[model samples]
Target chain A: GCPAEQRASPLTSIISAVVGILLVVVLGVVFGILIKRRQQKIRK
Target chain B: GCPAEQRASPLTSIISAVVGILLVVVLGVVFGILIKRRQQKIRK
Candidate 1:
């Protein structure tokens, strides 16, 4: 149980960090596009 | 501001949902592999 718990913790942390980074990037891009579209609409 | 708000809502939601699903899948695979390795160690 100790070894399993220890092993799982790092793996979970790594996965969580990677997922967090990915979400940030993906969401940033999506929001960037949405903002650009809004600006264009305003210009029109 | 209202138009921007309305436009961003759907886009942000879609991004959030997609990121959430991907995180689940990636975490699932990592945890699955870790568990399989643990089982092998136990058997040995």
Candidate 2:
């Protein structure tokens, strides 16, 4: 029998890995900004 | 012979699908906020 078509492509996995890393980075930045704003308010 | 060790996990595929959709949604929200700010500036 031949190989089935249900396998995930290397490109797909690579794209997913990139996206996952980006999401983590973006979320970290967002949190950082929020924390900075809080510190600003507290300092006033 | 046994299956190779290079296959992507089903969980990985599912996580990728969810992450992709979330990325689209988050970007859309960010663009919406930017456009709203631009509109407010124009009204001033």
Candidate 3:
């Protein structure tokens, strides 16, 4: 009997990628907002 | 004397969001097309 490592489906790979991109986008937005807030708070 | 904290413009914050969304959308389309190709390429 031969047991091999389980392979992920192509669709799942792409779906995971899509989810990753969304997370990146959200993180990007959060940093942008925080940067602006700290910049303004520093001066005012 | 004031020390510079390497501040970026607030407008650029939204711009980061716009560009991030654009990139996400562009990637979204590419993944969709690639998923379709995988089904056929697996057999054909």
Candidate 4:
């Protein structure tokens, strides 16, 4: 039985998929920025 | 208008949110590690 629970709407599904991808992109950015800043600090 | 087929439970939504956050964290770490390795190779 589906228990009338967790019914994923098409819109939500699309949004979730988009967010998942954005998460990966943001992660990459964070990593790059952190490393760059750290390297800069080391050079000072 | 929305598909009722995938209605998320409150609990499931919460879990999804947590997992989504974790995914971002993992992605950030992955990029950081990859970049670090590249930098080390460049130093050689």
Candidate 5:
């Protein structure tokens, strides 16, 4: 029998990986900024 | 005939993804903090 196509494609994974990484970078910046502001408020 | 196993495993991809993502997070925070500090220094 031939190999089924249920396997994840490397090309597809790489594309998704990059897309997700970019998404996180944006979220991480917003998240980091907010946390830094909170941290700034914590002390003098 | 059986398929050769040169293909990437999704489990491996996920593990590497998580590791790389965590690494980026640490670096991102450091990078963000430095940039923000420079921005803060720019004006009143």
Candidate 6:
């Protein structure tokens, strides 16, 4: 898929990448929140 | 990193660039599949 991007469709290559990043951000935040809270409970 | 493909490069640069991106896409797909399995576990 990446080779395809460079080989063709250079302009349209990054479509939905920002959306993909935002999804990762959301996953990180949710995972951080849950893990952080769990750690706090363990420490208490 | 996501949008770098928009920055038009020549054939040589494009060839080298895709290797890193291919790794990213492979990792992304693998992690995506693993994450889906994690969600399914939470649902059960």
State, as a TM-score between 0 and 1, how close model 5 is to the true structure: 0.34
Using lDDT as the measure, which candidate wins?
2
What lDDT tens digits, residue by residue, belong to model 6 across residues B4-43?
5354445545444555456557767998998987875565
Residue ranges of candidate 5 with Cα displaced over 4 Å: A1-9, A12-26, A29-40, B1-8, B15-19, B22-26, B29-33, B36-40
Distance from true location, Cα of A12 in model 3, Å: 34
Output the lDDT of residue A41, model 6. Answer: 52
Query: What's the TM-score of each model vs. the native?
Result: 0.37, 0.41, 0.39, 0.45, 0.34, 0.33
Could you list the CA RMSD of all candidates, in the order they appear? 21.3, 10.3, 23.2, 6.0, 9.0, 11.6
Question: A19 in model 3: Cα distance from truth in Å?
Answer: 15
Residues A1-44 of candidate 3: C-alpha lDDT, one tens digit per residue: 64544443444434445555776778769978989878755654
Tell me the tens digit of each residue's lDDT in model 2 across A1-44.
64445545565566677777677678779978989878755655
lDDT of 4: 0.65
Judge candidate 6 at residue A15 and give its lDDT.
Answer: 36
The residue pairs that clash in candidate 2, if any, are: none
Q: Model 4 off-target regions past 4 Å?
A: A1-4, A40-44, B1-44
Candidate 1: pairs in clash: none
Compared with the true structure, all predictions reach lDDT values of 0.56, 0.69, 0.59, 0.65, 0.65, 0.58
Could you tell me how far off, in angstroms, the CA of residue A36 lies in candidate 6 after the best superposition?
0.6
- Summarize candidate 6's per-residue lDDT along A2-44 as a digit string, tens digits: 4443344444345335435555667669988999878755655
Query: What lDDT does candidate 5 reach at residue B43?
Result: 60
TM-score of chain A of each: 0.62, 0.68, 0.64, 0.61, 0.49, 0.52
Mind giving the per-residue lDDT tens digits that candidate 1 earns over A1-44? Answer: 22221222233443455556776678769878989878755654
Number of the top DockQ candidate = 4
| TM-score, model 3 to reference | 0.39
Better of 1 and 3 by TM-score: 3
Q: Candidate 6, overall lDDT?
A: 0.58
DockQ of 6: 0.07
